[PDB]
Amino acid sequence: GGEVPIGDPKELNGMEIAAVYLQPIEMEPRGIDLAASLADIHLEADIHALKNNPNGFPEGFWMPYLTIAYELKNTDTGAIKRGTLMPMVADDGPHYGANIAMEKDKKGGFGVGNYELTFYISNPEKQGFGRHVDEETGVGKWFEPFKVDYKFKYTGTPK
Amino acid sequence: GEVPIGDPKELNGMEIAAVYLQPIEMEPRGIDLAASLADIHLEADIHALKNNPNGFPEGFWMPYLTIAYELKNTDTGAIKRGTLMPMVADDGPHYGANIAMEKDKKGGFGVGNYELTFYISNPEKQGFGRHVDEETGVGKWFEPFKVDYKFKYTGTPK
Ligand SMILES: [Cu+2]
Ligand SMILES: [Cu+2]
C-alpha cells in the first residue's frame, strides 16, 4: 500500500489537521483495534501544532490527549459508521488511527465510492491533561469542541 | 526561572531531565496541589533522542507515560512520594507537580541535600498503541524503570 490524503489539510485552532488513509496496520496491544486481516484501510488524523500555538505547544509537535471521533459516510449508498481514532505510534511518529473495514464490512455499503468524513475533536482537558494558567508560565484557554469535514473518493485498499 | 535537578539520563530512546521552579497554577482545579500550599513545581522533561526505537521523532515530547516520584531529604531522612501529571505551560508539555517543601506539614523537606527518583511506565499502560507491521512498525516498549538524581534544594524561588 501507500499513504492517501483525504481532502485538504485545515489550519484551525492553532493546529494543522489532515486526514489520510493507508493499508490496514497490525497494532499492539492486540485486541483494542480491528485486526488487519479484517480491515481494508487504516484511517489517521495527523494533527500538529502550528507556529504561535496559543496553548503552548511548539511548532510541529504532535497534539496529544485529543478525543477524536469520526463519522464516515458513503454518500452514494447512505452507509454510515462512526468510531474513535486512538492514539498510537508508527515508525514516522505518533498519530490518531483506526483500522476500518470497507469492502469487508457486510453490514453496510462501504465499497468504492464517494465519502464524507467528519472528525469531532475535543481538547486535551477532556482527558484530564492540564494547563498552566499563572501569569508567569500560563497559556491560553483551550478551543471548544469542533468539527472538520473532508470529501474524498475511496478507490479500494492500497494494494 | 528553572533550577536543574542533578544530571540528565538518556535511556530507552528518551532524554530524562528534572527541573524545578516556583509553584504554578494549573487547570483543571482540584488535581495539582494549589500554588499557595506549594514551594516548587517539579517537572520531568522527557523527549525523544535520535533514532528513538518506538518511532518518536527526535525532540518530541514523550506522551502517555505514567510517572511517580520519590523525593528524599538525605540530611533529615524525610521521604515523600507522588505522581507527576501531564500538562502544558508556555514552554510546552511536561509532567509536573506542585510540591510542598518548607510548607509540608510533616516537616523535614526544607533546604538541604536531596535524592529524587522517577518511576516510569510505558504508554501502553494508558492504552496507547504501536504499529508492528513490517512497513511501519516499531519495537517493543521499555519495562517499568527508575531513574535517580541528586541535587541541593536551596529554598523556594517564588
Ligand atoms: Cu495507526
Ligand atoms: Cu506543570
Side-chain angles (χ1 to χ4, degrees):
Chain A
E3 202 167 311
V4 189
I6 292 172
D8 293 310
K10 276 74 174 162
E11 293 190 12
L12 303 169
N13 284 328
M15 302 175 279
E16 183 194 27
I17 305 157
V20 302
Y21 71 95
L22 52 162
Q23 71 271 19
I25 287 296
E26 218 65 81
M27 193 195 81
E28 292 224 84
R30 299 177 78 177
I32 50 159
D33 204 23
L34 191 60
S37 63
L38 289 42
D40 299 283
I41 59 176
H42 194 68
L43 177 60
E44 304 193 347
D46 276 336
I47 308 185
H48 300 82
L50 299 176
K51 199 175 212 289
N52 300 308
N53 174 274
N55 307 111
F57 280 85
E59 184 182 7
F61 266 31
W62 185 56
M63 302 298 293
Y65 301 90
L66 299 179
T67 306
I68 305 183
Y70 69 84
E71 182 177 293
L72 187 57
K73 175 171 207 276
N74 180 317
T75 55
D76 303 323
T77 66
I80 304 176
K81 60 169 67 192
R82 297 170 176 101
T84 63
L85 297 186
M86 67 165 283
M88 71 187 75
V89 70
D91 68 344
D92 69 329
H95 63 258
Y96 295 92
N99 273 352
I100 298 179
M102 296 292 284
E103 295 100 314
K104 290 176 179 84
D105 197 321
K106 287 294 157 298
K107 322 180 278 296
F110 290 106
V112 150
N114 299 296
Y115 285 78
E116 291 181 351
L117 170 67
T118 310
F119 289 153
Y120 303 80
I121 302 177
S122 300
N123 71 52
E125 202 172 289
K126 196 179 170 166
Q127 294 185 26
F129 184 87
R131 58 171 197 118
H132 295 203
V133 301
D134 51 282
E135 180 200 294
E136 315 81 57
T137 71
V139 301
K141 211 183 157 200
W142 289 114
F143 57 86
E144 287 289 309
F146 69 101
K147 296 169 213 193
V148 292
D149 297 303
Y150 307 85
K151 293 193 190 165
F152 74 102
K153 306 101 201 192
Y154 175 62
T155 56
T157 299
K159 56 191 182 297
Chain B
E2 296 151 45
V3 176
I5 292 182
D7 287 306
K9 309 316 189 272
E10 290 182 6
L11 27 41
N12 303 326
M14 304 183 273
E15 164 187 283
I16 311 184
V19 298
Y20 73 91
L21 61 143
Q22 75 279 355
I24 63 82
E25 291 282 32
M26 193 194 86
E27 284 195 24
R29 282 306 192 150
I31 304 180
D32 191 41
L33 180 72
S36 76
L37 300 175
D39 290 289
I40 62 175
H41 194 64
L42 180 60
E43 299 180 356
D45 269 333
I46 308 184
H47 303 81
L49 302 169
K50 293 172 166 62
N51 277 310
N52 173 278
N54 305 112
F56 279 83
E58 188 186 7
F60 270 27
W61 183 61
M62 306 293 300
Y64 297 93
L65 295 177
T66 302
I67 308 187
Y69 71 87
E70 174 189 291
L71 184 60
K72 173 173 208 183
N73 180 323
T74 58
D75 298 322
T76 68
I79 296 168
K80 66 198 295 181
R81 304 184 170 284
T83 56
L84 304 177
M85 293 290 296
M87 66 189 75
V88 65
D90 62 354
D91 59 354
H94 63 258
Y95 297 94
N98 275 353
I99 301 171
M101 297 294 283
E102 293 93 325
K103 291 173 186 164
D104 197 306
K105 66 177 176 174
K106 295 180 294 303
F109 296 106
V111 174
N113 299 291
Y114 283 80
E115 276 173 4
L116 170 70
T117 310
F118 296 148
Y119 299 94
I120 302 172
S121 311
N122 76 44
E124 192 176 307
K125 185 171 196 270
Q126 294 181 17
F128 188 88
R130 66 181 174 103
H131 290 206
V132 297
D133 54 295
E134 196 161 306
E135 293 74 11
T136 72
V138 301
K140 277 184 178 174
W141 293 112
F142 60 84
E143 288 282 291
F145 67 100
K146 65 189 191 61
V147 290
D148 288 278
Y149 307 87
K150 311 205 189 327
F151 71 110
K152 299 184 122 62
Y153 176 57
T154 52
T156 178
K158 185 46 126 51

Short mmCIF file of all heavy atoms in Angstrom, two decimals, chain A residues 105-152:
data_model
loop_
_atom_site.label_atom_id
_atom_site.label_comp_id
_atom_site.label_asym_id
_atom_site.label_seq_id
_atom_site.Cartn_x
_atom_site.Cartn_y
_atom_site.Cartn_z
N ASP A 105 -16.73 -4.95 5.22
CA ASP A 105 -17.94 -4.77 6.03
C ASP A 105 -19.17 -5.32 5.33
O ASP A 105 -19.58 -4.79 4.30
CB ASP A 105 -18.14 -3.29 6.35
CG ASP A 105 -19.08 -3.08 7.50
OD1 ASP A 105 -20.09 -3.81 7.58
OD2 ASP A 105 -18.81 -2.18 8.30
N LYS A 106 -19.79 -6.37 5.86
CA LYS A 106 -21.03 -6.84 5.26
C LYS A 106 -22.29 -6.23 5.87
O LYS A 106 -23.41 -6.54 5.41
CB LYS A 106 -21.09 -8.38 5.24
CG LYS A 106 -20.16 -9.03 4.21
CD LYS A 106 -20.53 -8.72 2.76
CE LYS A 106 -19.33 -8.89 1.83
NZ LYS A 106 -18.19 -7.98 2.13
N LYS A 107 -22.15 -5.34 6.84
CA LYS A 107 -23.36 -4.73 7.47
C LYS A 107 -23.72 -3.37 6.84
O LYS A 107 -24.66 -2.71 7.29
CB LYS A 107 -23.23 -4.57 8.99
CG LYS A 107 -22.49 -5.74 9.70
CD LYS A 107 -22.37 -5.56 11.19
CE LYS A 107 -21.19 -4.67 11.56
NZ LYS A 107 -19.88 -5.27 11.20
N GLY A 108 -22.97 -2.95 5.81
CA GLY A 108 -23.32 -1.75 5.00
C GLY A 108 -22.58 -1.63 3.66
O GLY A 108 -21.81 -2.49 3.29
N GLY A 109 -22.86 -0.59 2.88
CA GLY A 109 -22.25 -0.42 1.55
C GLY A 109 -21.10 0.54 1.72
O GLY A 109 -21.23 1.74 1.56
N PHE A 110 -19.96 -0.05 2.08
CA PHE A 110 -18.74 0.68 2.31
C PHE A 110 -17.73 0.31 1.25
O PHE A 110 -16.55 0.15 1.55
CB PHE A 110 -18.23 0.33 3.68
CG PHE A 110 -19.09 0.87 4.79
CD1 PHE A 110 -19.92 0.03 5.52
CD2 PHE A 110 -19.05 2.22 5.10
CE1 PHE A 110 -20.72 0.53 6.54
CE2 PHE A 110 -19.85 2.73 6.14
CZ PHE A 110 -20.66 1.91 6.85
N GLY A 111 -18.21 0.18 0.01
CA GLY A 111 -17.35 -0.16 -1.11
C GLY A 111 -16.76 1.09 -1.74
O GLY A 111 -16.90 2.20 -1.22
N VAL A 112 -16.11 0.91 -2.89
CA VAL A 112 -15.56 2.01 -3.65
C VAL A 112 -16.65 3.06 -3.89
O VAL A 112 -17.79 2.70 -4.20
CB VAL A 112 -14.91 1.53 -4.99
CG1 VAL A 112 -15.01 2.60 -6.08
CG2 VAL A 112 -13.44 1.11 -4.75
N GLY A 113 -16.32 4.34 -3.71
CA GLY A 113 -17.28 5.40 -3.98
C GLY A 113 -16.97 6.73 -3.35
O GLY A 113 -15.86 6.97 -2.91
N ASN A 114 -17.96 7.62 -3.33
CA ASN A 114 -17.80 8.95 -2.72
C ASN A 114 -18.15 8.99 -1.23
O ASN A 114 -19.22 8.49 -0.82
CB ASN A 114 -18.73 9.91 -3.45
CG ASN A 114 -18.39 10.04 -4.92
OD1 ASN A 114 -17.31 10.51 -5.27
ND2 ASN A 114 -19.33 9.65 -5.80
N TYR A 115 -17.26 9.61 -0.43
CA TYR A 115 -17.35 9.65 1.01
C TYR A 115 -17.26 11.04 1.59
O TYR A 115 -16.57 11.91 1.07
CB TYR A 115 -16.24 8.79 1.68
CG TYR A 115 -16.55 7.33 1.55
CD1 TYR A 115 -16.33 6.67 0.36
CD2 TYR A 115 -17.11 6.62 2.61
CE1 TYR A 115 -16.67 5.32 0.21
CE2 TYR A 115 -17.45 5.29 2.48
CZ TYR A 115 -17.22 4.64 1.29
OH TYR A 115 -17.57 3.34 1.17
N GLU A 116 -17.98 11.23 2.67
CA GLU A 116 -17.82 12.37 3.54
C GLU A 116 -17.23 11.84 4.85
O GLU A 116 -17.72 10.89 5.42
CB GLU A 116 -19.18 13.06 3.76
CG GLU A 116 -19.73 13.76 2.53
CD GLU A 116 -21.07 14.47 2.77
OE1 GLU A 116 -21.69 14.31 3.84
OE2 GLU A 116 -21.52 15.21 1.86
N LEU A 117 -16.15 12.45 5.30
CA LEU A 117 -15.54 12.14 6.59
C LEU A 117 -15.58 13.37 7.48
O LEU A 117 -15.25 14.48 7.03
CB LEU A 117 -14.08 11.68 6.40
CG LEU A 117 -13.16 11.53 7.62
CD1 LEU A 117 -13.60 10.39 8.53
CD2 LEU A 117 -11.72 11.30 7.15
N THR A 118 -16.02 13.18 8.73
CA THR A 118 -16.05 14.23 9.73
C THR A 118 -15.26 13.81 10.95
O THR A 118 -15.37 12.67 11.40
CB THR A 118 -17.52 14.56 10.14
OG1 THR A 118 -18.34 14.76 8.96
CG2 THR A 118 -17.58 15.79 11.04
N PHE A 119 -14.43 14.70 11.47
CA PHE A 119 -13.80 14.48 12.74
C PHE A 119 -14.47 15.44 13.71
O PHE A 119 -14.73 16.60 13.36
CB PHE A 119 -12.31 14.86 12.68
CG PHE A 119 -11.43 13.91 11.87
CD1 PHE A 119 -10.28 14.39 11.29
CD2 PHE A 119 -11.71 12.56 11.73
CE1 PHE A 119 -9.43 13.56 10.57
CE2 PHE A 119 -10.85 11.72 11.00
CZ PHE A 119 -9.71 12.24 10.43
N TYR A 120 -14.76 14.93 14.90
CA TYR A 120 -15.25 15.72 16.01
C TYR A 120 -14.14 15.73 17.04
O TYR A 120 -13.81 14.68 17.60
CB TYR A 120 -16.50 15.05 16.60
CG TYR A 120 -17.62 14.83 15.61
CD1 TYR A 120 -17.60 13.76 14.73
CD2 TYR A 120 -18.70 15.68 15.58
CE1 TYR A 120 -18.63 13.56 13.85
CE2 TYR A 120 -19.73 15.47 14.69
CZ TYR A 120 -19.68 14.43 13.82
OH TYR A 120 -20.73 14.27 12.94
N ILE A 121 -13.53 16.89 17.28
CA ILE A 121 -12.31 16.98 18.07
C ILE A 121 -12.58 17.73 19.34
O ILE A 121 -13.11 18.82 19.28
CB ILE A 121 -11.22 17.69 17.25
CG1 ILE A 121 -10.98 16.90 15.95
CG2 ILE A 121 -9.90 17.90 18.08
CD1 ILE A 121 -10.00 17.48 14.96
N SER A 122 -12.20 17.15 20.49
CA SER A 122 -12.29 17.83 21.76
C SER A 122 -10.91 18.02 22.33
O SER A 122 -9.99 17.23 22.08
CB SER A 122 -13.18 17.05 22.73
OG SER A 122 -14.49 16.90 22.20
N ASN A 123 -10.75 19.06 23.13
CA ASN A 123 -9.45 19.42 23.63
C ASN A 123 -8.90 18.43 24.68
O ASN A 123 -9.64 17.57 25.21
CB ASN A 123 -9.46 20.88 24.13
CG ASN A 123 -10.25 21.05 25.43
OD1 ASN A 123 -10.03 20.34 26.39
ND2 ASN A 123 -11.13 22.04 25.47
N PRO A 124 -7.60 18.56 25.02
CA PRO A 124 -6.95 17.59 25.94
C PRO A 124 -7.49 17.58 27.36
O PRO A 124 -7.31 16.60 28.06
CB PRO A 124 -5.51 18.06 25.96
CG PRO A 124 -5.29 18.62 24.61
CD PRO A 124 -6.59 19.40 24.36
N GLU A 125 -8.13 18.67 27.77
CA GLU A 125 -8.64 18.76 29.12
C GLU A 125 -9.75 17.74 29.36
O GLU A 125 -9.93 17.30 30.50
CB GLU A 125 -9.10 20.18 29.46
CG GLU A 125 -9.14 20.43 30.94
CD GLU A 125 -9.41 21.88 31.27
OE1 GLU A 125 -8.53 22.75 31.05
OE2 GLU A 125 -10.52 22.12 31.75
N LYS A 126 -10.46 17.35 28.30
CA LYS A 126 -11.50 16.33 28.40
C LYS A 126 -10.91 15.03 28.97
O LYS A 126 -11.60 14.30 29.69
CB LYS A 126 -12.14 16.05 27.02
CG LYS A 126 -13.46 15.30 27.11
CD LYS A 126 -14.11 15.04 25.76
CE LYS A 126 -15.30 14.07 25.91
NZ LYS A 126 -16.19 14.04 24.71
N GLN A 127 -9.64 14.76 28.68
CA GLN A 127 -8.91 13.61 29.19
C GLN A 127 -8.07 13.91 30.46
O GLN A 127 -7.34 13.06 30.95
CB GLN A 127 -8.06 13.00 28.08
CG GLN A 127 -8.92 12.41 26.98
CD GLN A 127 -8.13 11.67 25.88
OE1 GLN A 127 -7.01 11.17 26.10
NE2 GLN A 127 -8.74 11.57 24.71
N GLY A 128 -8.20 15.11 31.01
CA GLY A 128 -7.53 15.47 32.28
C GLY A 128 -6.11 16.03 32.16
O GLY A 128 -5.42 16.23 33.17
N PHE A 129 -5.68 16.27 30.93
CA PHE A 129 -4.42 16.93 30.64
C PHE A 129 -4.54 18.37 31.11
O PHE A 129 -5.53 19.02 30.79
CB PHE A 129 -4.19 16.90 29.12
CG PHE A 129 -2.87 17.47 28.69
CD1 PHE A 129 -1.72 16.67 28.63
CD2 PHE A 129 -2.79 18.78 28.25
CE1 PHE A 129 -0.55 17.20 28.22
CE2 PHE A 129 -1.61 19.30 27.81
CZ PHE A 129 -0.48 18.52 27.78
N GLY A 130 -3.53 18.85 31.84
CA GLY A 130 -3.56 20.15 32.47
C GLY A 130 -2.94 21.28 31.66
O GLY A 130 -2.31 21.06 30.61
N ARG A 131 -3.20 22.51 32.11
CA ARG A 131 -2.51 23.69 31.59
C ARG A 131 -2.19 24.66 32.70
O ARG A 131 -3.00 24.90 33.63
CB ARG A 131 -3.26 24.39 30.44
CG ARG A 131 -4.62 24.83 30.77
CD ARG A 131 -5.25 25.70 29.69
NE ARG A 131 -6.36 26.38 30.33
CZ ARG A 131 -6.51 27.68 30.49
NH1 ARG A 131 -5.65 28.58 30.01
NH2 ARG A 131 -7.58 28.11 31.13
N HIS A 132 -1.00 25.25 32.61
CA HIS A 132 -0.65 26.34 33.49
C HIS A 132 -1.50 27.56 33.11
O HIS A 132 -1.69 27.85 31.91
CB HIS A 132 0.85 26.70 33.41
CG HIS A 132 1.77 25.62 33.90
ND1 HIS A 132 3.05 25.89 34.34
CD2 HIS A 132 1.60 24.29 34.06
CE1 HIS A 132 3.65 24.77 34.69
NE2 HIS A 132 2.78 23.78 34.54
N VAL A 133 -1.99 28.25 34.14
CA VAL A 133 -2.75 29.50 33.96
C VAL A 133 -2.21 30.70 34.73
O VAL A 133 -2.76 31.80 34.63
CB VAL A 133 -4.24 29.27 34.30
CG1 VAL A 133 -4.79 28.20 33.43
CG2 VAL A 133 -4.42 28.90 35.78
N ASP A 134 -1.14 30.53 35.47
CA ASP A 134 -0.47 31.62 36.14
C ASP A 134 0.17 32.56 35.11
O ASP A 134 0.45 32.18 33.98
CB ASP A 134 0.57 31.11 37.12
CG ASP A 134 1.52 30.11 36.50
OD1 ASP A 134 1.10 28.94 36.33
OD2 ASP A 134 2.65 30.51 36.16
N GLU A 135 0.38 33.80 35.53
CA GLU A 135 0.89 34.85 34.63
C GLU A 135 2.27 34.51 34.08
O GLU A 135 2.58 34.79 32.92
CB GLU A 135 0.89 36.20 35.37
CG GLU A 135 1.39 37.43 34.57
CD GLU A 135 1.82 38.58 35.47
OE1 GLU A 135 0.97 39.16 36.17
OE2 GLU A 135 3.03 38.91 35.48
N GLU A 136 3.07 33.85 34.91
CA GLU A 136 4.47 33.69 34.61
C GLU A 136 4.68 32.58 33.59
O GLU A 136 5.50 32.71 32.67
CB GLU A 136 5.29 33.46 35.90
CG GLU A 136 4.91 34.40 37.07
CD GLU A 136 3.66 33.94 37.86
OE1 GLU A 136 3.65 32.80 38.37
OE2 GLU A 136 2.68 34.72 37.98
N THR A 137 3.91 31.51 33.69
CA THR A 137 4.11 30.36 32.79
C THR A 137 2.87 29.88 32.06
O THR A 137 2.92 28.85 31.40
CB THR A 137 4.64 29.15 33.59
OG1 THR A 137 3.60 28.63 34.41
CG2 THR A 137 5.83 29.54 34.45
N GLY A 138 1.78 30.65 32.14
CA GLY A 138 0.47 30.21 31.72
C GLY A 138 0.30 30.30 30.21
O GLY A 138 1.08 30.96 29.54
N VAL A 139 -0.73 29.64 29.71
CA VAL A 139 -1.04 29.60 28.27
C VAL A 139 -2.51 29.93 28.12
O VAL A 139 -3.23 30.08 29.13
CB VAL A 139 -0.72 28.21 27.65
CG1 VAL A 139 0.73 27.88 27.83
CG2 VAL A 139 -1.60 27.12 28.27
N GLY A 140 -2.95 30.07 26.87
CA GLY A 140 -4.30 30.41 26.56
C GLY A 140 -5.27 29.28 26.82
O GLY A 140 -4.88 28.13 26.97
N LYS A 141 -6.54 29.65 26.87
CA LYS A 141 -7.66 28.71 27.05
C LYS A 141 -7.75 27.75 25.84
O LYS A 141 -7.46 28.12 24.73
CB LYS A 141 -8.95 29.51 27.20
CG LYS A 141 -9.99 28.88 28.07
CD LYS A 141 -11.26 29.69 28.12
CE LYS A 141 -12.44 28.79 28.52
NZ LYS A 141 -13.77 29.33 28.15
N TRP A 142 -8.15 26.52 26.09
CA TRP A 142 -8.40 25.56 25.02
C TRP A 142 -9.59 25.91 24.14
O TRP A 142 -10.62 26.46 24.60
CB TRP A 142 -8.65 24.17 25.60
CG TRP A 142 -7.45 23.50 26.19
CD1 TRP A 142 -7.25 23.20 27.49
CD2 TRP A 142 -6.30 23.06 25.48
NE1 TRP A 142 -6.04 22.58 27.64
CE2 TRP A 142 -5.42 22.51 26.43
CE3 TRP A 142 -5.92 23.10 24.14
CZ2 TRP A 142 -4.18 21.95 26.07
CZ3 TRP A 142 -4.69 22.55 23.77
CH2 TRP A 142 -3.84 21.99 24.74
N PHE A 143 -9.46 25.52 22.87
CA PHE A 143 -10.57 25.56 21.92
C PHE A 143 -11.75 24.72 22.40
O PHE A 143 -11.58 23.72 23.11
CB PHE A 143 -10.14 25.04 20.55
CG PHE A 143 -9.59 23.64 20.58
CD1 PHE A 143 -10.41 22.55 20.51
CD2 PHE A 143 -8.22 23.44 20.66
CE1 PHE A 143 -9.88 21.25 20.51
CE2 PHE A 143 -7.70 22.16 20.68
CZ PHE A 143 -8.53 21.08 20.61
N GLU A 144 -12.93 25.17 21.99
CA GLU A 144 -14.16 24.48 22.25
C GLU A 144 -14.23 23.35 21.24
O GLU A 144 -13.59 23.45 20.18
CB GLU A 144 -15.36 25.42 22.08
CG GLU A 144 -15.46 26.44 23.22
CD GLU A 144 -15.89 25.81 24.55
OE1 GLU A 144 -16.91 25.08 24.57
OE2 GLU A 144 -15.22 26.06 25.58
N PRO A 145 -15.03 22.31 21.52
CA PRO A 145 -15.08 21.20 20.60
C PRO A 145 -15.59 21.61 19.20
O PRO A 145 -16.49 22.46 19.07
CB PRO A 145 -16.03 20.20 21.29
CG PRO A 145 -16.22 20.67 22.65
CD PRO A 145 -15.96 22.13 22.65
N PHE A 146 -15.01 21.01 18.17
CA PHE A 146 -15.30 21.43 16.80
C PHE A 146 -15.24 20.28 15.84
O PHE A 146 -14.71 19.21 16.18
CB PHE A 146 -14.33 22.55 16.36
CG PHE A 146 -12.92 22.10 16.18
CD1 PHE A 146 -12.41 21.86 14.91
CD2 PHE A 146 -12.08 21.97 17.28
CE1 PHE A 146 -11.10 21.44 14.73
CE2 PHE A 146 -10.75 21.55 17.12
CZ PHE A 146 -10.25 21.31 15.84
N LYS A 147 -15.82 20.49 14.67
CA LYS A 147 -15.83 19.52 13.60
C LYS A 147 -15.06 20.02 12.38
O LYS A 147 -15.04 21.21 12.09
CB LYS A 147 -17.27 19.20 13.13
CG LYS A 147 -18.14 18.53 14.17
CD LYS A 147 -19.61 18.50 13.72
CE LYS A 147 -20.57 18.61 14.91
NZ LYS A 147 -21.98 18.27 14.56
N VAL A 148 -14.47 19.07 11.68
CA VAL A 148 -13.88 19.32 10.37
C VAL A 148 -14.37 18.24 9.43
O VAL A 148 -14.49 17.08 9.82
CB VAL A 148 -12.33 19.39 10.40
CG1 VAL A 148 -11.85 20.61 11.19
CG2 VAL A 148 -11.74 18.11 10.97
N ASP A 149 -14.68 18.65 8.20
CA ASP A 149 -15.24 17.76 7.16
C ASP A 149 -14.32 17.63 5.96
O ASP A 149 -13.68 18.62 5.57
CB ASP A 149 -16.57 18.31 6.61
CG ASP A 149 -17.63 18.40 7.67
OD1 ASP A 149 -17.93 17.36 8.28
OD2 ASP A 149 -18.17 19.50 7.88
N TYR A 150 -14.30 16.44 5.35
CA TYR A 150 -13.49 16.16 4.16
C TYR A 150 -14.35 15.34 3.21
O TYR A 150 -15.14 14.52 3.64
CB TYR A 150 -12.25 15.31 4.48
CG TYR A 150 -11.37 15.85 5.57
CD1 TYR A 150 -11.65 15.58 6.88
CD2 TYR A 150 -10.23 16.60 5.29
CE1 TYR A 150 -10.85 16.09 7.90
CE2 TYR A 150 -9.41 17.08 6.30
CZ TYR A 150 -9.73 16.82 7.60
OH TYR A 150 -8.95 17.29 8.62
N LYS A 151 -14.18 15.56 1.91
CA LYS A 151 -14.84 14.72 0.90
C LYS A 151 -13.74 14.04 0.10
O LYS A 151 -12.72 14.64 -0.20
CB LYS A 151 -15.71 15.56 -0.02
CG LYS A 151 -16.92 16.17 0.67
CD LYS A 151 -17.92 16.72 -0.35
CE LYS A 151 -19.02 17.55 0.31
NZ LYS A 151 -19.78 18.36 -0.67
N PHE A 152 -13.92 12.75 -0.18
CA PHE A 152 -12.92 12.02 -0.93
C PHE A 152 -13.54 10.84 -1.65
O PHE A 152 -14.64 10.38 -1.31
CB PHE A 152 -11.75 11.59 -0.03
CG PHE A 152 -12.06 10.47 0.91
CD1 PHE A 152 -11.63 9.17 0.63
CD2 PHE A 152 -12.73 10.70 2.10
CE1 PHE A 152 -11.87 8.13 1.51
CE2 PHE A 152 -13.00 9.66 2.97
CZ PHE A 152 -12.56 8.37 2.69
#
